Design a protein around this ligand. Structure first.
Ligand SMILES: [Cl-]
Ligand SMILES: [Cl-]
Lengths: 211, 208
């Protein structure tokens, strides 16, 4: 039935891939990247960055921090990684799962951190990327303010818990309208390869400090 | 913009009221579905007299519970959370049943509780001979027993009390919910709730 097919969290997306990874056995210094289309697109645009370094992408387009929390056990914990990199909030602010509530989104990140720590997985937290607006939801007129406010909460939580915070945002924002840098996005939200190369330099340096 | 899959709206106002009034020593939060929701409806005094807080929502699965856990449990700063989860997972209210996924969500809640110094009581999924609203599920009794065995084993391994409502409430070769404890075959009546109360309050008093 259609009802039986429901899979709100999209656990199906990586179910087979996870089984294949698990079959290979424990791997040293595995890093899983949790996120939405920015993380999914990262693997799509620069697979070598992941493959060269033993990183595993678990991004799914359109998803919010609520979806990530639901997938966290299967798509992170069960892969027995050394470290998880969390990029969450863009689609929350874009209202993909309903009205944005910062407290709920921030709480989902904290929950993921707690689940990682309960399973001896190290965490890196990251800034939500700049966006002046979201192409698919122009009704959101205060994306910049929301992004900054959430990022400040994530950064403070990271400091309070001795978790690295990787600030993609400050390197990629441009203008008084707080756009994603015009030179490496087409749509204002998703990086092009040039943008991903900026992110790679930051995240690899932080990963290497932790591993 | 009205989407709210986890139904965090249900108790949002009630939670704000509790947080204003300040944390209470020995608060117990009950997480669950209509069985937990109906408990409060049928015996408000049980909750009120004992400083227990019900956070059940009809139809929900363990996935919904996980999404609500921080707002409806952690932020209430309780001493203890009682988790009853799995009926609607097996009934496939939110899609195909996967024991690994449902059990995983319970483990996730346990880990979030422990990360916040909240004690846990785990409980048995109640018996049901069948779920009339979903006739495609032909093996509910078998699934309930297997999930419960898994929960019990995990509880023992992690020194978490397990409260076995099922063993007191099951009847017959068809593993029905006792006809004295239900009208519809799934949801307890008051008489059924009184059986549950005796079990859970004895267990709570040992922990607190
Ligand atoms: Cl950490
Ligand atoms: Cl405990």
């Amino acid at each position: 039935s259609d009802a039986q097919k429901q899979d709100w969290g999209n656990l199906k997306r990586y179910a087979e891939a996870n089984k294949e990874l698990v079959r290979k056995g424990k791997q040293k210094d595995r890093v899983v990247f949790m996120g939405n289309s920015i993380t999914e697109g990262w693997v799509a645009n620069d697979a070598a960055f992941f493959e060269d370094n033993g990183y595993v992408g678990r991004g799914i387009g359109g998803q919010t921090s609520s979806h990530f929390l639901l997938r966290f056990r299967e798509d992170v914990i069960k892969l027995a990684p050394a470290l998880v990199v969390i990029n969450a909030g863009t689609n929350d602010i874009a209202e993909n799962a309903g009205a944005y509530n910062e407290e709920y989104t921030f709480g989902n990140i904290v929950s993921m951190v707690e689940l990682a720590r309960a399973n001896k997985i190290k965490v890196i937290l990251t800034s939500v990327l700049p966006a002046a607006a979201f192409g698919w939801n122009p009704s959101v007129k205060d994306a910049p303010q929301k992004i900054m406010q959430l990022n400040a909460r994530i950064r403070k939580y990271a400091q309070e818990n001795k978790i690295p915070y990787v600030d993609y945002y400050s390197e990629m924002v441009e203008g008084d309208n707080k756009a994603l840098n015009s030179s490496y996005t087409r749509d204002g939200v998703h990086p092009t390869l040039e943008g991903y190369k900026v992110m790679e330099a930051l995240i690899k340096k932080a990963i290497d400090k932790v591993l």
